Amino acid sequence: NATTFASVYAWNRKRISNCVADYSVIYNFAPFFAFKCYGVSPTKLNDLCFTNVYADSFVIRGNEVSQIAPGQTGNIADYNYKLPDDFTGCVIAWNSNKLDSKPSGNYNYLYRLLRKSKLKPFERDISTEIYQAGNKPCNGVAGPNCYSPLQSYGFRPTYGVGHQPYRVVVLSFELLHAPATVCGPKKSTNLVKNKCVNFNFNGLTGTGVLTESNKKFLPFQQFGRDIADTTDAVRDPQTLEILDITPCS
Amino acid sequence: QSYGFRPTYGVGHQPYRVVVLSFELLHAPATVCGPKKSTNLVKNKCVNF
């Protein structure tokens, strides 16, 4: 519901923790022609927990929405905003012509036409260093060998699809077996032990009999895996007890 | 409760529809087929069918 996002080169990361996010409350906003999740589905979010979730916001000129994805290449993917191949998140976009455009021509958004090399994933290069293609030092202003990289998009309501301003939101989360901070509007049932029962911890499901073993974890550990990478220990999100998972009879 | 459409609305707000043509292609008696004209039932010879 913000008024004006940032540029693609100066995208603003909004860290989010200590909450319960009901992702269903996002659909009631502007249309989502693209709600692609590359590591998970757009439905299993309200059933899983997350370690650290971030939200990147930036406007683009529409025809470049395809570059916001793993393995993508282009001006935005190479100089402004790049995502890794192991990405685990969801990408959302929608048109904002009536918000981030003006008939007189808006010049607040930039895309960093040029750069020395390809920017790395999740990095920012808002530095205003004038690129230099020649050998002689630049005179502080654009010249035959140095050019101003901070170009701009002259958005206008008259432009057509592929040129109108589209807002893009990139929600990333790490589903590693680490302490969780966001889980969703899920409910909590009483604890049962010493009997075969299904369990749904912070994203971890399975069958087994808990026994409350003596495993002494560390302040940053929440799960324990055996030789076969099968979880055998879990920490209670509502207490400090260390439970031991074992297969039923 | 009911929705409401209006011509002056923009893209997306316009009305859309959906249709799901469920099919069943297992080996069972056929009730619907394509316009493929039926040829003659040549018998007692190696032919494609």
Epitope: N1, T3, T4, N12, A55, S57, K98, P103, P157 | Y9
Partner: antibody
Framework: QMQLVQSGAEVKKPGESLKISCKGS????????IGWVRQMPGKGLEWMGI????????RYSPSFQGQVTISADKSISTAYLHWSSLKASDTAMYYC??????????????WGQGTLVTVSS | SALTQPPSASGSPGQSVTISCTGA?????????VSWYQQHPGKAPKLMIY???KRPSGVPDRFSGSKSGNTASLTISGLQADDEADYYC?????????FGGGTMLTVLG
């Protein structure tokens, strides 16, 4: 030269669905957000809602989501504030506004002249 | 949270006065969503400050704005006999315009 003009004063009884106007010229009315502001006697300003004359896109204040209906005629560049089942408490001055060539899309840089409304019984 | 302002303020010609404002909001777009409008007695308001470190074109330099934390400030380099009017700070961060409560400005009489 940009300029705005709204309807004149009005004094009527409740029940009637009043509808005042806010006409402007000198700009591309189809591509500039328009809205209205409420201000009771002795009180401050209160945001009513905005409209995008380019299409039917209209955002209304949460407390005024349905208490009033805002419309605009793109063929003549004239905004309208149509009411529905007026109440005696709706008496107040109403200013329409728009966004200029600078600032955010809802900065409300330019304002209208205002329209006094008294709908007592 | 709704915006709040001092009930009023006083001054005299030539003196530099300032007005405050508290209760702002924020978003991913920044924290500069504060605008001041001066409304004279019985007539349409006028925009005076937007992007507190800036202001519209043609606006006299007698006014200035600044922000600090959740509180803003409207600085005036000098008052005038015709400067007696109301002032309202307004926030437009989360696509929602929430005007201020209003504060009166007067001079010694």
């Amino acid at each position: 030269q940009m300029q705005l003009v709204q309807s004149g004063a009005e004094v009527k009884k409740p029940g009637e669905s009043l509808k005042i106007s806010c006409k402007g010229s000198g700009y591309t009315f189809s591509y500039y957000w328009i809205g209205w502001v409420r201000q009771m006697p002795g009180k401050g300003l209160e945001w009513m809602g905005i409209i995008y004359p380019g299409d039917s896109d209209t955002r209304y204040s949460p407390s005024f989501q349905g208490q009033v209906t805002i419309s605009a005629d793109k063929s003549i560049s004239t905004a309208y504030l149509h009411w529905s089942s007026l109440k005696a408490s709706d008496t107040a001055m109403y200013y329409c506004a728009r966004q200029g060539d600078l600032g955010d899309w809802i900065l409300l840089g330019y304002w209208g002249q205002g329209t006094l409304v008294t709908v007592s019984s | 949270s709704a915006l709040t302002q001092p009930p009023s303020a006083s001054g005299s010609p030539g003196q530099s006065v300032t007005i405050s404002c508290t209760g702002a909001s924020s978003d991913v777009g920044g924290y500069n969503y504060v605008s001041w409008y001066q409304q004279h007695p019985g007539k349409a308001p006028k925009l005076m400050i937007y992007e507190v470190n800036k202001r519209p074109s043609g606006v006299p330099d007698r006014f200035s704005g600044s922000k600090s934390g959740n509180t803003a400030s409207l600085t005036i380099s000098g008052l005038q006999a015709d400067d007696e009017a109301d002032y309202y700070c307004c926030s437009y961060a989360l696509s929602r315009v929430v005007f201020g409560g209003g504060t009166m400005l007067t001079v010694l009489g």
